[PDB]
């Protein structure tokens, strides 16, 4: 098991286990899952009524600094009632640790809009509004970043297809660029690559 297998450490695993238990002890109101993966990064799975209390606690409290904010995304999962998962990805400075606050929401719910406690989340929140479709209440500006103005449909969903519905071309009738329904020149052949035979037995869900 020594060559070409990534050696895991248990000190960081035990410390992140103890710290996740500590966080869920001191915030009993909003905490549902506290998971540590095999490669020792903490994940805290959260009801959407405590985004401001959890992040105001985690930016401060002097035993977990977590000054820096990274990726925010809300991965567009069907099959559930609450679809979207918002992932605040908090990085400390004094500690060298990484935690992922994963709160859940559906299509029509305002989460508490972390722009007041992380100024980096301004364009992150505006981008997630434009691409996914999750409205954020008590927020200064929501406009469309990374999309065209005349374009809509919230394209990063699984429901929006790969090619869009509109397609631009210049024409000389009205002497400008117009939008037309898509007429592709090639199919975009989708391949049926997901072969059977269960490549991981450790991740078998229990059947009905």
């Amino acid at each position: 098991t020594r060559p070409t297998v990534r050696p895991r450490n248990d000190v960081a695993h035990k410390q992140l286990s103890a710290f996740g238990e500590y966080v869920a002890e001191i915030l009993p109101k909003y905490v549902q899952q506290v998971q540590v993966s095999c490669f020792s990064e903490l994940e805290i799975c959260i009801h959407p009524d405590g985004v401001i209390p959890v992040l105001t606690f985690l930016r401060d409290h002097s035993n977990a600094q977590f000054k820096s904010l990274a990726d925010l995304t809300a991965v567009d999962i069907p099959t559930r009632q609450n679809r979207f998962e918002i992932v605040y990805n908090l990085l400390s400075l004094r500690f060298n640790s990484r935690i992922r606050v994963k709160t859940y929401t559906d299509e029509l719910t305002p989460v508490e809009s972390s722009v007041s406690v992380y100024k980096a989340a301004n364009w992150y929140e505006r981008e997630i509004w434009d691409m996914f479709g999750v409205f954020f209440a008590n927020h200064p500006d929501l406009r469309r970043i990374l999309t065209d103005y005349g374009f809509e449909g919230h394209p990063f969903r699984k429901d929006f297809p790969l090619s869009g519905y509109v397609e631009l071309r210049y024409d000389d009738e009205v002497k400008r660029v117009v939008a037309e329904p898509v007429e592709l020149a090639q199919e975009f052949r989708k391949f049926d690559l997901n072969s059977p035979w269960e490549a991981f037995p450790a991740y078998r869900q229990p059947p009905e």
């Binding site: 099959t79 809509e152 449909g153 929006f160 297809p161 519905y165 007429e183 072969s195 035979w197």
Partner: protein, 126 residues
């Protein structure tokens, strides 16, 4: 808070941006995919795939490709139960045909009956 109290269906079809043609024209077949019969493995089961009907794929007259006027045709939505499939199909607006999941029948095979005395289960070749 929790001010809104209502028990009604969702109407996201006016928000998701897809036009009325592809709302009320196509149809969603909801099905467990069949086992790829040349292989023998039911790992391709357990996932309720939602797919749409296929439409015209003519020939591109310069190369011989498959051009299409179909944005929604190359979708697949893998789910885990029939109820959430029906809920998503009724929520997002379009029509739906829910097919059936057909389990393999639990049989009883026996090598000792493959080597019987008076019965007609005598394989005569092994």
């Amino acid at each position: 808070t929790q001010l809104i109290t209502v028990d009604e269906k969702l109407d996201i079809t006016t928000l998701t941006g897809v036009p009325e043609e592809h709302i009320k024209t196509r149809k969603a077949r909801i099905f467990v995919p069949a086992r790829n019969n040349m292989q023998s493995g039911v790992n391709n089961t357990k996932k309720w795939k939602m797919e749409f009907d296929t439409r015209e794929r003519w020939e591109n007259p310069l190369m011989g490709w498959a051009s299409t006027a179909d944005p929604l045709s190359n979708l697949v939505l893998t789910f885990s139960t029939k109820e959430d499939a029906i809920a998503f199909a009724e929520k997002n607006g379009w029509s739906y045909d829910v097919e059936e999941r057909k389990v393999p029948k639990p049989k009883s095979k026996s090598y000792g009956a493959n080597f019987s005395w008076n019965k007609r289960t005598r394989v005569s070749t092994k």
